[PDB]
Every structure is written in C-alpha cells, then in structure tokens.
Design a protein around this ligand. Structure first.
Ligand SMILES: O=P(O)(O)O[C@H]1[C@H](OP(=O)(O)O)[C@@H](OP(=O)(O)O)[C@H](OP(=O)(O)O)[C@@H](OP(=O)(O)O)[C@H]1OP(=O)(O)O
Ligand SMILES: Nc1ncnc2c1ncn2[C@@H]1O[C@H](COP(=O)(O)OP(=O)(O)O)[C@@H](O)[C@H]1O
Ligand SMILES: NCc1ccc(-c2ccoc2)c(Cl)c1
Ligand SMILES: NCc1ccc(-c2ccoc2)c(Cl)c1
Ligand SMILES: NCc1ccc(-c2ccoc2)c(Cl)c1
Ligand SMILES: [Mg+2]
Ligand SMILES: [Mg+2]
Length: 325
C-alpha cells in the first residue's frame, strides 16, 4: 500500500474543532426568500450552475445569484458550510444569502457582486508588478482557507474574480472544496484538468492543501510565460505526460517511490523519458518583461511533484518575488 502523508501546516485544525464546524451533513441550512432578489442577466455558467447578476430590492444593491443544477444534496450542504465558515476571510467571496425556488425546488446561493474584468483584455495590459500583486492576494485567500482547515481543490483563473479598477480580488467557486482531515483518502477526480496536481493524476488519495499550491503554480507559469494553459493535457493521462515533459521523468519516479505509489502500468507506455527542463527555456520576446530570476525561483518552488516539498501559502508570501508588494 502507499506511504501515508500529512500537510506540513494546519494539520490538526479540524481535529481540534467541534463537530459543528466540519460536519456539514448535520449543518442546519436556513433558506431565505427569493422575492428579495430580481434577476438582471446571465453572468456565466459552470458544470454545476447558472450564475446571474441580480438586485436586492430591499437595499438597491447588486448581488450574484448562483442557481445550483442537479447534484448530490451532500455537495450543496458542503459548499454552504465551507462558505459560512470562511465568510469574512481575506479575498474570499462573501455568501450573503441562500434562497430556494418554491416551485421548482431549486437552491441558489447569493453572493457579493464582483465586477469581473475580462481575462483577454487583462492579459496584455498586466505588468510584472500586477502579476505579483494579484498572486499575493490569492495567497492571502489560500493561507486563510488552509488555516481554517479547508482545501479549495479548484484553483484556476476562472475561479478568481478580479475588479482591476478597484484592485479587488475574490476566490470563488467553493463547490469542490473539502475539509482537510489528516490521513483521509480523498476523491482524486477534483480540480480542472490543466490545474490537477501530480498526486491526483497518479491516484494518490492522501493529498492536502498543497494541491492548491500546485494549481497556483500552473496559473503563475501561464501568466509569466503567456502560455495558457501551461500544462496542456488533452486527457487526465496525457496531463501527467505534459508535466513530465517539463519536470522530467526522473523526479516523477522519485515521487512515486517516496510514497510507494502504484503507478498505473499504462503510464509506462505514454510517459517516455524526458529530461528536466530549465524554467529559463520558457522565456521569449513576448513574455520576458514578466519574467525575473525571483519569479523563476518562486515558480520552481511551487511546481514540484512532491506535494510536501512545495511552499505552503505562508512560506510563498515570504518569497523575494513579493518584496515589491
Ligand atoms: O502557445 P501558442 O504559441 O499559442 O501555441 C499553442 C500550443 O502550441 P505550442 O506549444 O507548440 O506553441 C498548443 O499546443 P500544446 O501545448 O497543447 O501541445 C496548441 O494547443 P493544441 O495542441 O490543443 O492545438 C495551441 O493551439 P490552440 O490555440 O488551438 O489551443 C497553440 O496555440 P496557437 O495555435 O495560437 O499557437
Ligand atoms: N461573485 C461573482 N461575481 C461575478 N461573477 C461571478 C461570481 N461568481 C460567479 N461568477 C461567474 O459565474 C461563473 C460560474 O461561477 P461558479 O458558479 O462559482 O462555478 P461553477 O458552476 O463552475 O462550479 C464564473 O466563472 C463567473 O463568470
Ligand atoms: N468523514 C470525514 C471525517 C470527519 C471528521 C473527522 C474527525 C474530526 C475530528 O475527529 C475526527 C475525520 Cl478524521 C474524518
Ligand atoms: N424574484 C425572482 C426570482 C425567481 C427565481 C429565483 C430563483 C433562485 C433559485 O431558483 C430560482 C430568484 Cl433568486 C429570484
Ligand atoms: N478571472 C480571470 C483571471 C485573470 C487574471 C488572473 C491573474 C493575473 C495575475 O495573477 C492572476 C486571474 Cl487569477 C484570473
Ligand atoms: Mg467555476
Ligand atoms: Mg462561487
């Protein structure tokens, strides 16, 4: 069997807390009334919801209404309890209300509105300083939720709302988030393909908060190198091969051996042999103004196969890459 693993930080935060904090199945959800909200327009969609801009008619304030689609009721209770636990945390989206549609029996979550700036319009305008600034804001949200015993497990650009004009950043979409319990074996079918950590791809179930630090590394690589996504897998198996084409196959076997992971033998047919690439090889004329020795050193410390070797969110905040913020 595989070697057990635990987070290096905030390991026993849920162990020392009462049942009410982490037992989301037992949590009493009090559903408000939808009549306080008038829907304005569709803002987005996801594999799990339909998201609308709305107005709260009791204070003329804009809100966001996330109407939840057919899914396990256990999953909705989990998302509600985590949002309630993290409510008020730095750069965490604020859950304002929970309402139901009497007729169709459909639950909806009501959030604070974020005036999200478009990514395609943002990319070219983003400077080295702006990347450092926003990366730091995400770290504040991750250090906070990890300190609260929660793993986000779906860190990606689509789940980060930025109101560039107000330099306001919010980490959203807590639908895949989970309570960290040391030694727990989690479902590896989480995160979005390009952002999945090697632990998920090799089916190592005892992962932790460090999964979020890998995803953050993928976002940083994509921003500084202007290559979106950075690891462009066409499926979950190919995703590991794309990582192996950068980090090399030697360190992948060291990781598998350290945790006694039973690697699916089909991988030995597609992985091949790949040398470890230097991060400097991703520097080109279009991205050199965003790359620096500090940026490459910070990225190298997040994008590691070994989930225990990655920087924690607090260690990342102390990195020289952030001295200017
Ligand atoms: O980053 P770009 O210069 O835009 O090039 C990428 C990249 O190709 P290179 O890595 O060879 O530059 C992708 O290839 P992979 O990294 O995925 O192997 C490819 O994606 P597909 O292979 O899925 O086509 C993508 O094409 P697309 O824009 O259709 O995603 C293509 O972009 P360009 O064609 O714009 O260069
Ligand atoms: N608070 C928000 N402010 C503005 N837009 C948001 C907000 N929350 C969600 N959105 C939009 O709705 C989309 C879907 O968000 P989300 O429902 O949380 O994820 P999913 O359905 O994929 O689990 C986002 O990608 C974004 O475009
Ligand atoms: N079903 C997941 C789960 C929930 C709670 C705990 C717990 C917390 C404190 O003592 C045991 C553990 Cl270890 C696992
Ligand atoms: N007052 C109009 C209206 C109508 C329906 C909804 C709804 C929320 C969740 O499901 C439906 C909401 Cl939020 C508002
Ligand atoms: N909502 C799309 C989007 C766009 C840009 C970033 C970014 C930029 C620099 O650091 C993070 C992020 Cl996190 C998300
Ligand atoms: Mg989403
Ligand atoms: Mg959300």
């Amino acid at each position: 069997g595989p070697v057990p693993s635990r987070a290096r930080v905030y390991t026993d935060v849920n162990t020392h807390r009462p049942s009410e904090y982490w037992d989301y199945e037992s949590h009493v959800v009090e559903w408000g009334n939808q009549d306080d909200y008038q829907l304005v327009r569709k803002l987005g969609r996801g594999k799990y919801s339909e998201v609308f801009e709305a107005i709260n008619i009791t204070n003329n304030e804009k809100v966001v209404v996330k109407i939840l689609k057919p899914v396990k009721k256990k999953k909705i209770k989990r998302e509600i309890k985590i949002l309630e636990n993290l409510r008020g945390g730095p750069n965490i989206i604020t859950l304002a209300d929970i309402v139901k549609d009497p007729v169709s029996r459909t639950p909806a979550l009501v959030f604070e509105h974020v005036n999200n700036t478009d990514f395609k319009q943002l990319y070219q305008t983003l400077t080295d300083y702006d990347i450092r600034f926003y990366m730091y804001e995400i770290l504040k949200a991750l250090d906070y939720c990890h300190s609260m015993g929660i793993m986000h497990r779906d860190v990606k650009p689509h789940n980060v709302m930025i109101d560039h004009e107000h330099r306001k950043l919010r980490l959203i979409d807590w639908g895949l988030a989970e309570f960290y319990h040391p030694g727990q074996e989690y479902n590896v079918r989480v995160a979005s393909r390009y952002f999945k950590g090697p632990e998920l791809l090799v089916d190592y179930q005892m992962y932790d908060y460090s999964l979020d630090m890998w995803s953050l590394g993928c976002m940083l690589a994509s921003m500084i190198f202007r290559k979106e996504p950075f690891f462009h897998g066409h499926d979950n198996y190919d995703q590991l091969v794309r990582i192996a084409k950068v980090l090399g196959t030697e360190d992948l076997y060291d990781y598998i051996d350290k945790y006694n992971i039973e690697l699916d033998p089909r991988f030995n047919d597609i992985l091949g042999r790949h040398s470890r690439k230097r991060w400097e090889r991703f520097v080109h004329s279009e991205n050199q103004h965003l790359v620096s020795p500090e940026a490459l050193d910070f990225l190298d410390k997040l994008l590691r196969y070994d989930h225990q070797s990655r920087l924690t969110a607090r260690e990342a905040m102390e990195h020289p890459y952030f001295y200017t913020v």
